[PDB]
Structure 1
Amino acid sequence: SGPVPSRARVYTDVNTHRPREYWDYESHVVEWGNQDDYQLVRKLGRGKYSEVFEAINITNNEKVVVKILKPVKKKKIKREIKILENLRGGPNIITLADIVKDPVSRTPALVFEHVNNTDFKQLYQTLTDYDIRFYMYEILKALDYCHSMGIMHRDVKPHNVMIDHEHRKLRLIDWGLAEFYHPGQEYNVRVASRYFKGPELLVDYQMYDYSLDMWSLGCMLASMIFRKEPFFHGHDNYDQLVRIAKVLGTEDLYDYIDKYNIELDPRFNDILGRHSRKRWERFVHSENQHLVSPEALDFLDKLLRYDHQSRLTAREAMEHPYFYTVVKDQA
């Protein structure tokens, strides 16, 4: 036969219970403003699907970010917009403030609240163990919210987390890969960034769920606390899985494959090999020990599992002892 079906352990039917217009983004009609309200100041970054500019709203002098979309499928634009609107006001979700089209070229852009991330290379290399716990909690607040709202982010990774440390402000950004979760729907595995792709995506298991975001969360925590960017440094999609096999081991991988009756690409035959599951200690050394603790390693081990159904949910994660101290201060 073919694969064994899978359903998310939490928020399973959340979208079944909502009215249709909530998730049927194909039919959302969009209302465009004039980009001429917004004047671009400088460029902030590029990417596969967009360029991002700092801009000024000339009607109220407010500073904003304009995200000019490169040509995506028309329905992916509706999708991102509908997701952003559904999540607007949620904890640590970037707030969408406008939808405009260039008046001549007719290119669409989204307008967001500005997050000030400048002097971030300092931030990277100087977050305390406490700050990492803090910002992990902030990320998790964003993921529990969007998962509870029936939405898979699918592209969690440091570049899609914006932090303004001066104001301990974190926003989860770029929802253009996000999808609504529906039980039984088979999704596109060609999502996320290579180093953050979950095993489900690498073996072509299409019926995945919110747990994917938590595998990605796992790869950021590991690469933060070990100081190894990226943690799983694969050289293509196939070899990405080998690199995970070299840490998680092959026994658990092949048990996962068997559990879900996954057809494994015959390419993986020769390369996956035979690998023992490593202890997290072999990634510790004097330069990163200050960020590694028993709690951090228990927490991380519970995110990086082959079987998506067995990874910690966002909510379960926020309850881990790792965050005991963060939870206390918030109060």
Structure 2
Amino acid sequence: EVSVIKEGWLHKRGEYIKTWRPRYFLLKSDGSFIGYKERPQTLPPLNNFSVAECQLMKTERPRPNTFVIRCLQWTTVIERTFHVDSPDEREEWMRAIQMVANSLKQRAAAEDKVTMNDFDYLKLLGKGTFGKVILVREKATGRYYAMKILRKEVIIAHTVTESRVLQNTRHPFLTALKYAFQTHDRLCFVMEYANGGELFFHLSRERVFTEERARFYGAEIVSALEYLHSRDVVYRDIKLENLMLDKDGHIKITDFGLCGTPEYLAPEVLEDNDYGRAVDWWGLGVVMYEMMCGRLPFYNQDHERLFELILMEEIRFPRTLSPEAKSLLAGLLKKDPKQRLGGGPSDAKEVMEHRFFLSINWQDVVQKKLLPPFKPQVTSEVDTRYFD
């Protein structure tokens, strides 16, 4: 019986637009902590909103009586920042959230060699607030991986956190975890790294993909998004720079984020609304628009003007785009998430059934039986041709 444990107004700092907005939050016994524009028994809340295993901290900047929920979601640290009027209300909120996180931990328990000197460290792939990602070579074998390194003091404040190597994604087009280990100071996630080049690189040179090429990539992404949504997980990071090709030409969605790019923000995410699975279909629409038209659907140097277009401007197309493509993209880029293709109760099913994908056998997709339309110029998984 899923019950509200605490509800009320909070000042929530925007996740991208760093601004404070009052929102009405419900902390529920299933661990979800979700905020609404007004005070609204429901379908599966997304794990993105869960307080399970989170760490709570008090701070007085930029305002007194601020608190932060910090969670390790898979391999990524997520932070949500809140503000209340008085230190008593902050305490009551933090104690209730911690209570729910304690209950969930108890329920989960009731229901259910490798070191840093084993790698060469070759190139920094990215760096964020909480950790970094480095291209490494495993010394014992010569294979290449991306190592995400995070400081322990961030979400431990921990051998149990090595159990991600079990809840590991099996999906062919997601990034799998090879090793997870800890040092005295840090946690290290060694994940696969595709050596077929960044899709941003391939699209930049080819200028524009044929519709058949974009359909192949889009279908692999749809299959990956179905898998994540079936686990109650939203990716929220779909963009060209998070898509790579493996040695055979299949998609790999990267898991390299660290605590954005405004041109990909869905309308409901700009207004700090309750967003859901529909934000991933918006993102698919933007990257498939990029692949088939060679440019972004909404762009402006002035971010105030960009937001207007994303919120307000109707999407326009080149007339050489097939009608099936114009229809897919207009459906994926509907402003209202409830009217968006894939935003309904069947989720990915609505997208998979669109006429643009009529030729796709979705079991061939997930079984990697579709012949890639482009084969990267690498002959093995250790060919470093694309590493610069």
For 1:5 and 1:73, the matched residues in 2 are separated by 33
Query: Which of 52, 74, 82 is equivalent to 1:24?
Result: 52
- How far residue 200 of structure 1 moved from its aligned partner, in angstroms, is 1.0
- How far residue 201 of structure 1 moved from its aligned partner, in angstroms, is 1.5
Matched, 1:310 2:358: no
Structure 1: 5+ residue stretches without partners: 17-21, 178-190, 249-277
Alignment check: 8 A CA contact 1:155 1:192 kept: no
The aligned runs of 1:49-88 (5 Å cut-off) are 51-69=132-150, 73-74=154-155, 86=167, 88=169
Name the residue aligned to 1:108. Answer: 187
AA aligned to 2:267 is P
Query: Which of 179, 197, 202 is equivalent to 1:118?
Result: 197
Matched, 1:13 2:13: no
2:189 is paired with a residue of what secondary structure?
strand
For 1:87 and 1:117, the matched residues in 2 are separated by 23
How big is each residue's C-alpha offset from its partner over 1:23-82, in whole Å with a ceiling of 9 and x where there is no partner? 824398x9x952122222x2163254554333222234433222334899427x99x988
Query: Which of 264, 270, 284 is equivalent to 1:196?
Result: 264
> TM (normalized to structure 2)?
0.57
Name the residue aligned to 2:292. Answer: 225
Q: Would the alpha carbon gap of residues 245 and 209 (structure 1) be closer, same or farther in structure 2, given more than 3 Å must change?
A: closer
How big is each residue's C-alpha offset from its partner over 1:77-126, in whole Å with a ceiling of 9 and x where there is no partner? 99x988886451024111011224466xx343321112113375245443
How big is each residue's C-alpha offset from its partner over 1:129-155, in whole Å with a ceiling of 9 and x where there is no partner? 211100000011110100110101111
How big is each residue's C-alpha offset from its partner over 1:202-225, in whole Å with a ceiling of 9 and x where there is no partner? 1121x2111111111111111222
> TM (normalized to structure 1)?
0.66
| Percent identity of paired positions between Structure 1 and Structure 2 | 24
The aligned runs of 1:90-239 (5 Å cut-off) are 90-101=171-182, 106-118=185-197, 121-126=201-206, 127-164=209-246, 166-174=247-255, 176=257, 193-205=261-273, 207-228=274-295, 230-235=296-301, 238-239=304-305
How big is each residue's C-alpha offset from its partner over 1:129-188, in whole Å with a ceiling of 9 and x where there is no partner? 211100000011110100110101111111111213x512211122757xxxxxxxxxxx
For 1:204 and 1:82, the matched residues in 2 are separated by 33
Alignment check: 8 A CA contact 1:194 1:236 kept: no
CA RMSD between the two structures: 3.9
1:151 is paired with a residue of what secondary structure?
coil
Alignment check: 8 A CA contact 1:139 1:170 kept: yes
Structure 2: 5+ residue stretches without partners: 1-23, 25-35, 56-71, 75-112, 343-347, 370-388
Name the residue aligned to 1:300. Answer: 329
Matched, 1:37 2:104: no
AA aligned to 2:356 is Y
AA aligned to 2:230 is S
Q: Specify which structure has the higher proportion of helix.
A: 1
For 1:70 and 1:231, the matched residues in 2 are separated by 38
- How far residue 316 of structure 1 moved from its aligned partner, in angstroms, is 1.4
Q: Specify which structure has the higher proportion of strand.
A: 2
Number of residue pairs the alignment of both structures matches: 263
For 2:139 and 2:309, the matched residues in 1 are separated by 50
For 1:324 and 1:72, the matched residues in 2 are separated by 50
Q: Which has the higher contact order (CA 8 A, sep 6+)?
A: 1
Q: Which consecutive segments of 4 or more residues in structure 1 shift more than 6 A?
A: 5-8, 80-84
Alignment check: 8 A CA contact 2:165 2:179 kept: no
For 1:7 and 1:159, the matched residues in 2 are separated by 38
